[PDB]
RNA sequence: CGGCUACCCACCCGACCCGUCUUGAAACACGGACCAAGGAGUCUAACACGUGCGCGAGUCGGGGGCUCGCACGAAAGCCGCCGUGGCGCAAUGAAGGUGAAGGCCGGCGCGCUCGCCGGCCGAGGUGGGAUCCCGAGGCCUCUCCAGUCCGCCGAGGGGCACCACCGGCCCGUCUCGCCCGCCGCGCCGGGGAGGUGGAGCACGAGCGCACGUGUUAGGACCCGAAAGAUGGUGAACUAUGCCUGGGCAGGGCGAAGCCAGAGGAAACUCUGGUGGAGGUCCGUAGCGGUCCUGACGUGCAAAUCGGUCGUCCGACCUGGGUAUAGGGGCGAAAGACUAAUCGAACCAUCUAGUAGCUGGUUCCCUCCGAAGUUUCCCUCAGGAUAGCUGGCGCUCUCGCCCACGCAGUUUUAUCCGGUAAAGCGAAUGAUUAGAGGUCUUGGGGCCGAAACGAUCUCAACCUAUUCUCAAACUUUAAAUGGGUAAGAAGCCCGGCUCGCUGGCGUGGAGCCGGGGUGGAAUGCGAGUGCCUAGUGGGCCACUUUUGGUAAGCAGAACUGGCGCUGCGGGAUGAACCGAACGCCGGGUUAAGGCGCCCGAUGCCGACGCUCAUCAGACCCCAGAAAAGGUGUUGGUUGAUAUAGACAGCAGGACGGUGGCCAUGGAAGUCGGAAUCCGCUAAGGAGUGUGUAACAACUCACCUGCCGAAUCAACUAGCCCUGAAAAUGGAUGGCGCUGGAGCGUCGGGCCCAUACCCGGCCGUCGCCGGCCUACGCCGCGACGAGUAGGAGGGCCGCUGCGGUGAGCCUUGAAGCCUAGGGCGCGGGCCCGGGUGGAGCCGCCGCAGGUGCAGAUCUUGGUGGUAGUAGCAAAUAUUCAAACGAGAACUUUGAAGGCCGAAGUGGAGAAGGGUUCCAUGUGAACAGCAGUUGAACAUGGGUCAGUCGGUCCUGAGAGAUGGGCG
RNA sequence: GUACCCAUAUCCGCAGCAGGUCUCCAAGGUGAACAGCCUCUGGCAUGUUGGAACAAUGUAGGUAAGGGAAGUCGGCAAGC
RNA sequence: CUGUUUAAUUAAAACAAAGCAUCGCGAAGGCCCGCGGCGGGUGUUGACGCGAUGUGAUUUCUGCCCAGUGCUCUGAAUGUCAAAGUGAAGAAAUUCAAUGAAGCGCGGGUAAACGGCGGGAGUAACUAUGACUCUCUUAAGGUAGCCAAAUGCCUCGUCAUCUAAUUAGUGACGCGCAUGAAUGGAUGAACGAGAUUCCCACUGUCCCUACCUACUAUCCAGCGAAACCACAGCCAAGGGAACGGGCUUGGCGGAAUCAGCGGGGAAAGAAGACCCUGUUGAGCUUGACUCUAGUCUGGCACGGUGAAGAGACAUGAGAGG
RNA sequence: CUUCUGACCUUUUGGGUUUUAAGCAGGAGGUGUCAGAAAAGUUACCACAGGGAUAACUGGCUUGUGGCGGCCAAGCGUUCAUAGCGACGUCGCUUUUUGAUCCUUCGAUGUCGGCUCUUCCUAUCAUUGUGAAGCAGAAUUCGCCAAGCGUUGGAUUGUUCACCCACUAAUAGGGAACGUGAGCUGGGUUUAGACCGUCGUGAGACAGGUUAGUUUUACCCUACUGAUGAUGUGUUGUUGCCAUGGUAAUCCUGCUCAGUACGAGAGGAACCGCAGGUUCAGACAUUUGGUGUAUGUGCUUGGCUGAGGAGCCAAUGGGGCGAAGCUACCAUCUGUGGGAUUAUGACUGAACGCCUCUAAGUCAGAAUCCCGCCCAGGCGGAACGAUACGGCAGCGCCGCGG
């Protein structure tokens, strides 16, 4: 009563039907995992910056279109 | 005259018997003698998903009620002040409980990491994103003005679905914090800011019906066990008691008791009779069954027969009645017997018990098409999980100087490794040998009373060297390989925010606005979601490799193949070498081959090698080495030959010197040291022949005739030796020798389903037409296939509603058919003949729906075959009669057997009319029959005194009583 | 109740199956005898068929010159 | 010894058996049955009896061990000790303590109860063998006997006899792998359908076969099946699931048959009884697990009357260091 | 599941207070078969579903082990490497030893040994023909062609093997599914009974020993043996031929040769021949012996026919003789030559001016091989005979024409 035990034969022509792909990466990648502190600051950083970056955004913008 | 045909026959080539387990099937693996009918994935519940329909934040009457009692009405219709209820619309907590709105602007409180107020909008934002909108400019016959109208648009705008991310909100917890509220001021509520767990929210998509697939529970694809439980029936065989009856020829051995005689003093002894005891001896019936391992062994028989056997007054044999009943009885004990069954009887039910295990699993065509691997399991024949497959789609991309994305690939850069190899005078580990040196000893020798007093030697030590190694060593270090990059998600500029960081407006991230896409080669359409079958037993080949002596062994890596696959070669084959398959006509080739089987060299083919008394003849491959050859053929390196070798013929083979060792010979000749010189052409102070010794003689050495190559080693091609196995045999055979062998090649030639061209069918894709739009054409690429999955079927069987002014006694169903056809098929249509009363087409619908198998079930018939076989116990013959008919019936005669423990005469149990007569001879009697126990008709059983009835026995059984 | 078989053909055994089954009566000769053999009373046609021939092998039976276990696991079987 | 047994493979050396032992029990008992009752059986019985075993005539014998394992007797002797009862804490559920039946452990006996019975080293005026001596050791270390046996591996042990020759048979040897005393040891007349060897007589068992009879078998008259059967049946080699009939290449091959014969058809019988797997079972056994009838105890009821003594509680007085 | 810890925690079901209990969060108590069942043995009385995924028997690959060889040459062999051996090493072959593997069969291939019987191999024990020896003769040993023909009788053990006695010329080695069970035998192994020893507390086990223990069927096809036959020649018969197949003869002794050769002697040959024998084959029955049912003859037991006479029955009643026939190595008879050649020995003669058996040529040469002699004669063929009345016929050769 013996079997064969452990191969790796016709494996890869296996893998290779579908074809190895890579993992798709899309952009804004998945933001979890980093450093608590810096996260900590980039929230504030977004909600202060959505609060505050209209006056002054807007006379830049409007400079800027004055020059060009 | 034409004709395909399921007619028959001839011929060439191909051609092993199907189904399944299997890596492998024609297998000396299993099932199948033949034929007809039956025969297997159904139904319900539940869930998931896809699909179709209706309604839609709802939906559902499935439970009731309402209508006159009408076949179809067990229908259908209605309820709505019948929505009770299910599912959903809201999640979350263990629970007490709690329970999803923000954005934009203006202002205030220190606008302070902070809260409040006022207005408006309303599910935030970022990057992609089908579509839509706007539009510079662009184009339509003289020049001006014209409008629709035409179409491309660089670019720009809002942006569906969905994807990715950030921000927001609810609930549970954790951390840090301060403020407010007051049916009552408290170990009371409410709130804030962060980071987390959630099956959440972030404008809802369900519900009902039906269909499909898959999974689970159910007898659940079909058949299958040894078992277990409940409840009953058996002691007619057998086991053992008990009661009542029955039965057992003759003989041999000769105890107790007795008698007589003799002896003895007594005790008692001796001799001859009588006597008839024995779990006693030979042997009959009876009962058993040892041996022949005899006969039989599809028998006479589901345990017999024949010889040969054991025991027969006994623990004997035996009939009837009666008792003991299944985990129980009984057992002189063998686990034997208990109705042909016993290491747990028989019958029915639970029961369609269970099975990871065998066997089967029924119509066609089209398309796609695997796996034998990871992990986990009392798992190792199995399942779950990934992977492989199929179906269902969906979201985008195309068509009208350049795109999106991707890649079993390369390049250009850039990293990574520690194997092959190499290395030890580089670490570690082993290891060979020589040389040099003088510190250290012990040990040897020598000068010496002794002294590192001096010296020689030894080992050890060190120094540079040298030979060989390493999977568990390494400085070095490949080839093959692995990752990343080769641009708009990117650059560059400018600014805002930050509680993070901090000399610094510093760093880092985020956000906003602006600016310029031409950024290696090559090829392609990509992305994504669901459901899920089968698979979880592998094997071989090149190369690298582990264990082993090795294997057609076990175990790995990379790639291919076989399995799942044909075809052309290798004769024959799974795996080899070419090459992969729709059906065909032409041409060409591949791998191979071209004496003849057998298509092609039937070339005036090229060059050489080899003869075998066992030749040789093509990867895998189907038998051979070490060694040897003056067999031949090349080749290498030397040595000789013109001052003549080489072998052949001819001449000699001395002298100082019978030199010396000896006096056994030796005057070169068994043995010993040696060894010079002269003459020459050269002689060896002599190789040997042979006289025991003296001697002729030769060899070494020398010279003539001679005429051009010769000698010695060594190497590799063919061939030979080495080479021996069982039935007679294998380059495939026949054969084959100026080849049909070996090696090198050429020119032609042969052919596979491969390639090309052309036709036809189908699938797929891309369309086209306002012609069954579910049809019609057009274009182009492709078609193999087991397990498996879908699609189509104007394939088929049976039934139901609809329809065909369907079909038929002027002949339907079914059946047969050397008849005519259609379709690729499932199958069908007509003709002809039987046949005698119902049948079909189409659109829907619903099934107990299609046979080769399952040692399938039932029914029938073959081959075997007019065969085996009608043989245990001696045996018949003649004449006559009745008769269609005489080996068997009956009578006579004759000859026989049973031979009184019978083949006789009568009974018990059992059988039930078989008893008897008459008549028949169809079937039955295993041949026949006038016969019978066969069939048909009709008869026969007479009792106070024969027995039952009556009695009790072994026992069984009722009331009283007790228990249940 | 009373027939009949009571069994190599009326029972059981799947049957006209050499199997099994309970008892009584039992002559003459030989002989010890109901031993085995032959007759008599009393039954019977040879046991589910016949004819022709006399091969092998059989199955049952019987002899053998010499030697007497040499055969064979064994004197098994047969013979004394 | 006679007897009996596995009917349908065993006839025995097995079984019983008389004889010998051993044990329980004086009837409110032993040993059993029974679902149940003082229901049955032994029992219509009473230790010369009933019940349960071992051994197996007689003759001669019955050795040594209570360590293990059983069995049994003994005492609340004292550790362990279950319900119920007592006492204490607590509002109570509850908790704790003391007391403590059987049994277990402690102690005694038993082997005609199961069973068991050593190995070294030296040692005698030729060598060997070794009575003796020392040591470890267990509960005891095989005593009387007996043997290559039916028990002995090595093994065809060694010697003698038997035969020409003997792995056989007998007789003796004994540090006997692993003999042995009711697990019975050793003899032993008689008898074994028991097992083995040799000798005499006898023979077809043989050298060596031959013949004869009966019944078949043969042919014919009649009457006639069954097993089995993919297809059918000539061989060599090769390859192949590795030993073809069928494939390939060769050898070759005439209809239809009868009587034989057993080489083949890996013939036919039978889903291998040997082996393995199954999470498939049944017999059995015990110091497997979980239980249970039966049984031994303790408690509470049925369950009463009379007398006496005490443990300890309840109260207070006196001694008490 | 238990246990402990943490919160002025939640729930303890009509509402309260307290005990208790449940819960949240996180630590421990274990699952060593370690992703976790709670678990002893035996079956020889066994059963069931299966497996050749998996042993025992063969077959196949493999050749360590076994057996059989080859090369080199240190030595042994009085001297001397190779007459005969040969270490140290080394290369092979064999499947008759054992082992390894699991490829085939588990819905069955009957398993050891013996008896009988056929064929084959050669790695030759003897015989024929030879060569070499440390071959004087004899007796041996080693080689070559060579499997034609032999390779026995017995005591033991079941044996294969082994060992022994005796014969012999010699007692060679094997294969064919470890040939051969529808051929036997069943002694052993290998069921169920039983005993003994060891082990196990036990049911029981023990390649430890002893003993008793059912061996099935052929009539199918093929093969083989034997017998009818079948096709063509018109029929049919006689006489025959041979294609092909089969093959059988073999060995020893005695007497002369001769106690001669040879040998110091002890010892001791060979060829031709002449007698026989062993083994086998083919016959045959005059003799000898069997057989005996001419049921032939004559004794004889018991019974039967009244008795003598004649007979009969007793599964051929017994035994005494015995015809014919069948038969025996238990009687007798017969068994035979030609050819090419192997091994080897030579001749001539080059290669290689010599030599040489070889290279071309030749010769002698055998139990081998083939044929003769001897069996059977084919989908093989000859030569010859007669070739169909009766009453028409009928049938042949020749000529025809339709
Ligand atoms: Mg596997
Ligand atoms: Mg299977
Ligand atoms: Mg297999
Ligand atoms: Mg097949
Ligand atoms: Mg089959
Ligand atoms: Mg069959
Ligand atoms: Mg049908
Ligand atoms: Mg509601
Ligand atoms: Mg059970
Ligand atoms: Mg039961
Ligand atoms: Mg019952
Ligand atoms: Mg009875
Ligand atoms: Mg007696
Ligand atoms: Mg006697
Ligand atoms: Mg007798
Ligand atoms: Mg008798
Ligand atoms: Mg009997
Ligand atoms: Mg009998
Ligand atoms: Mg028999
Ligand atoms: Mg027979
Ligand atoms: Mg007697
Ligand atoms: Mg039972
Ligand atoms: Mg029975
Ligand atoms: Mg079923
Ligand atoms: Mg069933
Ligand atoms: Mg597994
Ligand atoms: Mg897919
Ligand atoms: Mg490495
Ligand atoms: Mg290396
Ligand atoms: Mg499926
Ligand atoms: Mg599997
Ligand atoms: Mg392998
Ligand atoms: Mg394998
Ligand atoms: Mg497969
Ligand atoms: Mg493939
Ligand atoms: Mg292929
Ligand atoms: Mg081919
Ligand atoms: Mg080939
Ligand atoms: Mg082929
Ligand atoms: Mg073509
Ligand atoms: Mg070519
Ligand atoms: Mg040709
Ligand atoms: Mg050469
Ligand atoms: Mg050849
Ligand atoms: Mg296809
Ligand atoms: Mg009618
Ligand atoms: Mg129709
Ligand atoms: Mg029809
Ligand atoms: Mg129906
Ligand atoms: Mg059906
Ligand atoms: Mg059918
Ligand atoms: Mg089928
Ligand atoms: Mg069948
Ligand atoms: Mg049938
Ligand atoms: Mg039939
Ligand atoms: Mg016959
Ligand atoms: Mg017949
Ligand atoms: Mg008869
Ligand atoms: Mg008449
Ligand atoms: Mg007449
Ligand atoms: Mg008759
Ligand atoms: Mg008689
Ligand atoms: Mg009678
Ligand atoms: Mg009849
Ligand atoms: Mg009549
Ligand atoms: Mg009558
Ligand atoms: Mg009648
Ligand atoms: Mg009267
Ligand atoms: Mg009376
Ligand atoms: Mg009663
Ligand atoms: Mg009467
Ligand atoms: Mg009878
Ligand atoms: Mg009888
Ligand atoms: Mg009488
Ligand atoms: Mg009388
Ligand atoms: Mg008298
Ligand atoms: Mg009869
Ligand atoms: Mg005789
Ligand atoms: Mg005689
Ligand atoms: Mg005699
Ligand atoms: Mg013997
Ligand atoms: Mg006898
Ligand atoms: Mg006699
Ligand atoms: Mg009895
Ligand atoms: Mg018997
Ligand atoms: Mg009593
Ligand atoms: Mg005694
Ligand atoms: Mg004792
Ligand atoms: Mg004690
Ligand atoms: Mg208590
Ligand atoms: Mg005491
Ligand atoms: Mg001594
Ligand atoms: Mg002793
Ligand atoms: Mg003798
Ligand atoms: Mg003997
Ligand atoms: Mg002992
Ligand atoms: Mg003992
Ligand atoms: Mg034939
Ligand atoms: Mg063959
Ligand atoms: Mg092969
Ligand atoms: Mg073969
Ligand atoms: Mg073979
Ligand atoms: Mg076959
Ligand atoms: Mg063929
Ligand atoms: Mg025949
Ligand atoms: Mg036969
Ligand atoms: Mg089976
Ligand atoms: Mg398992
Ligand atoms: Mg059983
Ligand atoms: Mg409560
Ligand atoms: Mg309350
Ligand atoms: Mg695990
Ligand atoms: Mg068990
Ligand atoms: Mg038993
Ligand atoms: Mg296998
Ligand atoms: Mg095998
Ligand atoms: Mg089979
Ligand atoms: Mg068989
Ligand atoms: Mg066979
Ligand atoms: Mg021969
Ligand atoms: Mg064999
Ligand atoms: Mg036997
Ligand atoms: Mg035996
Ligand atoms: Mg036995
Ligand atoms: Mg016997
Ligand atoms: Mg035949
Ligand atoms: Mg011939
Ligand atoms: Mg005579
Ligand atoms: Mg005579
Ligand atoms: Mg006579
Ligand atoms: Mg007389
Ligand atoms: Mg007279
Ligand atoms: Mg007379
Ligand atoms: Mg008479
Ligand atoms: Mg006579
Ligand atoms: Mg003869
Ligand atoms: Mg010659």
């Given at each position: 009563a013996k079997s064969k035990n452990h191969t790796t034969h016709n494996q890869s022509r296996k893998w290779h039907r579908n074809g190895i792909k890579?993992?798709?990466?899309?952009?804004?990648?998945?933001?979890?995992?980093?450093?608590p502190k810096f996260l900590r600051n980039m929230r504030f950083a977004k909600k202060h910056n959505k609060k505050g970056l209209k006056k002054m955004q807007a006379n830049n913008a409007k400079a800027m279109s004055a020059r060009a």
């Open positions: 890579k993992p798709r990466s899309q952009r804004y990648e998945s933001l979890k995992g980093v450093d």
